Ligand binder design. Structure first.
Ligand SMILES: CS(=O)(=O)c1nc(NS(=O)(=O)c2cc(Br)cc(Cl)c2O)cn1C1CCCC1
Ligand SMILES: CS(=O)(=O)c1nc(NS(=O)(=O)c2cc(Br)cc(Cl)c2O)cn1C1CCCC1
Lengths: 304, 302
């Protein structure tokens, strides 16, 4: 069994490299962010452009949705995050405190907190309602590439170019676990697995690894794509077959069998690095986005 | 201070009346049961359907979570209770012994015991590990409408259409107290601090009792409850509220101390038979009978 993702729509509009794509939790929308300082909202099923959201003063590296799909948070090189009302496009709050580019962000499942990571090497936890910074974690000794909450919000995982992944207790701010090897290439992405027991980490040795972080054991590796430079998102695809999905610096989307690690599909069409992919929450749909020779988002659909 | 619960999601999927909704202790999930013989699991923050759990041969009246959120127990008209692994959906044990419909169930905080009540007028205490019945208590003289453990599991409270609430010692099975006009008692549970019980009677009244002193400290009224066993709850995450469904299709919310109705949630199109309060967020789940068949999730700032 292999998926058969086929191209359905190409979405143009951004005027610099795209940086992130995310489907809303209710399945209805895709949000994209770009170095052009904009967020764009698109229909998830037909690619229809819905709106542009503007106000950051420099490029945007990441965007994340609240669980009720009503809010977005964005992380910008202007050293802020912004919380947006998706329906109106209005900026509700500007989150100030990082001292350099904000690279990654996420809401907790409860969506009362936002976590952010920055080039300033810190991880910050923010109150959604007030916009205030609740905690600053001295998390890493180099830029922070990803931050993600687990399924009950009680943990955060962070990754950094310092080579580490760390697990944090949300409520206390304490580091519960550091994952480190004899060799520690930059970690360019991390997230919790669907069941919360694993983390999937990308390193710039062209490799994805699935770790049991409690036991400190690497269960699976996914290779054959190209990733030595950019922070490229990876995903778990849960709607049909159990796949790992990632972009790649050879302009393809790679899809692997979770268990066997075999590459099961490569999606061809983009004309630059595929910096970001997202998997739809209920349908077998992938969104992919590329850097500045391309500047487009593609929507792909599969039977499994 | 008054809450401002607003509708966030409507969860459709059951094909007959919903009978109970419960949040998992870790806050991640809502479990629902229905007369359609199914349990459904839903995401607590995005309302997304997760899975259906099936195997009972007749409708289900109640479902309850273990304290690690890994197991469910369900009580059915098929006269059995089933213990389920939530991750796999598999039935681990079928608890056999009641001679009629099983109406209510709960784990203790340690989650090594389950308590059940039945139309057979008994309360049973079951070993989770083996599924064996440990004790049968001749608890009531009419159907048992609710059973609940206190904060550490040392006590059980039961209620019945016979008009009584009874407090039982878990370890010994002995009745420590009987609270005795005697309208049918359609629901009971211990308060968060274990010192009170909140009891619903089919005279449209919720009462908060100090059961050790035999004193009724508060009543909550203004809703409609003369027929169904409607759950009620203590809301501990924001303001101190009592929450209940109602036979006029609304969710009622009262101030614990003043007994004032502070909000009524409108949206359901049938009796709101069950409500649940999320363990850490100000989120209510409500569920309704068969003209409606949906669960609604509501969110408040306090
Ligand atoms: C193969 S397996 O199906 O047995 C399995 N499930 C998990 N859990 S996971 O990574 O969180 C997860 C990933 C996806 Br993609 C989808 C879902 Cl639903 C999901 O739960 C891991 N594995 C195996 C690989 C490593 C241990 C055995
Ligand atoms: C008003 S009060 O705050 O003084 C108060 N607390 C309790 N304890 S309770 O019922 O277990 C309880 C209920 C809720 Br709802 C939430 C929490 Cl957290 C909680 O602990 C009772 N009362 C008063 C009602 C009658 C006696 C005085």
């Amino acid at each position: 069994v292999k998926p058969n993702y086929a191209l359905k729509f190409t979405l143009a509009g951004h005027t610099k490299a795209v940086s992130s794509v995310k489907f809303s939790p209710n399945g209805e929308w895709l949000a994209s962010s770009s170095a052009d300082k904009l967020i764009k909202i698109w229909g998830a099923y037909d690619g229809k452009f819905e709106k542009t959201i503007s106000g950051h003063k420099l490029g945007i590296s990441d965007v994340a949705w609240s669980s009720d799909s009503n809010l977005l948070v964005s992380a910008s090189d202007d050293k802020t995050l912004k919380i947006w009302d998706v329906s109106s496009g209005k900026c509700l709050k500007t989150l100030k405190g990082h001292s350099n580019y904000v690279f990654c962000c996420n809401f907790n499942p409860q969506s009362n907190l936002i976590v952010s990571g920055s080039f300033d090497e810190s991880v910050r936890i923010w109150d959604v309602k007030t916009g205030k910074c609740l905690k600053t974690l001295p998390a890493h000794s180099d830029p922070v590439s990803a931050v993600h909450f687990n399924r009950d919000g009680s943990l955060i995982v962070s990754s950094s170019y310092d080579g580490l992944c760390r697990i944090w207790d949300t409520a206390s701010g304490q580091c519960l676990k550091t994952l480190i090897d004899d060799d520690n290439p930059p970690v360019s992405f991390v997230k919790f697995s669907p069941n919360g027991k694993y983390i999937l980490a990308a390193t710039l040795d062209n490799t994805l690894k699935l770790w049991d972080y409690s036991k400190g054991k690497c269960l699976k590796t996914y290779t054959g794509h190209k990733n030595e430079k950019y922070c490229i998102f990876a995903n778990f695809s849960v709607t049909g077959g159990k796949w790992i999905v990632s972009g790649s610096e050879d302009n393809l989307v790679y899809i692997w069998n979770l268990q066997t690690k075999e590459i099961v599909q490569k999606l061809q069409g983009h004309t630059d690095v595929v910096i970001s992919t997202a998997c739809h929450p209920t349908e077998n749909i992938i969104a992919s986005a590329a850097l500045e020779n391309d500047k487009t988002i593609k929507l792909w659909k599969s039977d499994c």
